[PDB]
Structure 1
């Protein structure tokens, strides 16, 4: 069973999730096995989609919250 979770993000939060050259979001894709989409735009209010089996969603979520805590 694959779940699809959408988070709402602020653009500052989003930058640290992508990281320099996308190296952070790269790491997250590889290590979580979640499909991660970050809405295209230099926009003030951004959507992060996480899709996959529960373990993948959980890994990806845990990594996002570690980024936001800094």
Structure 2
């Protein structure tokens, strides 16, 4: 199949700070490049939820960008 998906990641606050970036410049790149709908749960909480939604090519791009950021 080629159905749209919704993938949710449970992330530590520190990691989320890196994904968002100063002024949200990192997640802006992820949204503009991946084609995924990306939602990051509200508040600088110890644990946060990142939602990725779209077809597999978009999910793969966003997930790749997230793990690449975290590897930094």
Tell me the TM-score range normalised by the shorter chain: over 0.9
Distance 2:71 2:44 in 1: 22
Calculate the aligned-residue CA RMSD, in Å. Answer: 0.4
Match of 2:21 in 1: 19
Structure whose CA Rg is larger: 2
Matched, 1:51 2:53: yes
In structure 2, how many angstroms separate the alpha carbons of the residues matched to 1:58 and 1:25?
15
Q: Where do 5+ consecutive residues of structure 2 fail to align?
A: none
4+ runs of 1 displaced by more than 2 Å?
A: none
- Paired residue total: 70
- The alignment partner of 1:4 has SS state of strand
Normalization by structure 1: what TM-score? 0.98
* Residue ranges of structure 1 left out of the alignment (5+ in a row): none
Per-residue deviation, residues 11-35 of structure 1 (Å, max 9, x unmatched): 0000000001000000000000000
Per the TM alignment, residue 42 of structure 1 is displaced from its structure 2 partner at its CA by 1.3
